[PDB]
Amino acid sequence: SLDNNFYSVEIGDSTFTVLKRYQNLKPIGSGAQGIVCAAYDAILERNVAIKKLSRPFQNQTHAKRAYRELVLMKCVNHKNIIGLLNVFTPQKSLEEFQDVYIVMELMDANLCQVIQMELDHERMSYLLYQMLCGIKHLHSAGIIHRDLKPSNIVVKSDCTLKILDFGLVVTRYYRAPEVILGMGYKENVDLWSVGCIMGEMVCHKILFPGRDYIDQWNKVIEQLGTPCPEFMKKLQPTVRTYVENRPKYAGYSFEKLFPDVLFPADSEHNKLKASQARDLLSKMLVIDASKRISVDEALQHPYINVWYDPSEAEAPPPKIPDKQLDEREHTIEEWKELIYKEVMDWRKGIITIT
């Protein structure tokens, strides 16, 4: 059947081996962790995105990432998190296991492309509201992202927004000071990243585009200002010296960083205001996380709260199957077995004698 026969297609320098239900494959990314194709799903009669994770067990980092992705995509079912349509491997044993394919509903655009548009307050607010909903949903299951960025967020033609991944040529620009400086963190680490996306949406420029972490920290302090001694005292001694030795900067007020001229044209009497967006930016782009807003407070902010719906913002938490995502270490072979088991568990949840 279309659901049990495989065929192979060359996509650049890689072979995609997928169920025959998936037709007319066309590359749509990516780099670093694998390739993603658009396809027509002849059974569902609609378009899908198919990503190939090549040897996700190759090392601890790829492994723990692939595993988290499979488990979370499966147990989450939320408007603002990409859903899992199908998962499979073409290889027929643990010994032979190489590749995992994950199938998602195809979305029309990514957020990088949407950010480049001339947006209005209505759509900026709604996109931000949805990002905050997705983030809060993950946080309710104890999942803290740390690496939200526009290339990993997709958007439908009707503005529905979905986050594609679950957290941390790799893009460092959206990572919080906690991350840059190797500090402890809490949930509002993700709110820094939202601030960076929001800032970029407004000014059509990456806010902190460092070539590395040194350059990125420099751009943070040059624009927001050197943090206060109370923050400095929170740094572990090995990092505090570096931070305290940088040249000192006063930074710019948010009225200087984000003046009215950057906001939508002819929008002085909209329901939402540039001053509200600027106020929210000023509470998310706060170096000291203990002074930065929480997600809940962001959802209640005047720029965002227009859209507030408890079914989206107070949804029942995802149920992560018992102890499945604990802190434990595993060998590469152990990770390989865990990921194979997760792929095969998908079949076990579908097969029936009716």
Ligand SMILES: O=C(NC1(c2ccc(F)cc2)CC1)c1ccc2nc(N[C@H]3CC[C@H](O)CC3)c3nccn3c2c1
């Ligand atoms: O899974 C995706 N990216 C990640 C990834 C990709 C590959 C991989 F091996 C491991 C992880 C970070 C998760 C991904 C990338 C691009 C994705 N691009 C999509 N749509 C395109 C938006 C831009 C348009 O120009 C063409 C369609 C789309 N619709 C549903 C899911 N997606 C996409 C998912």
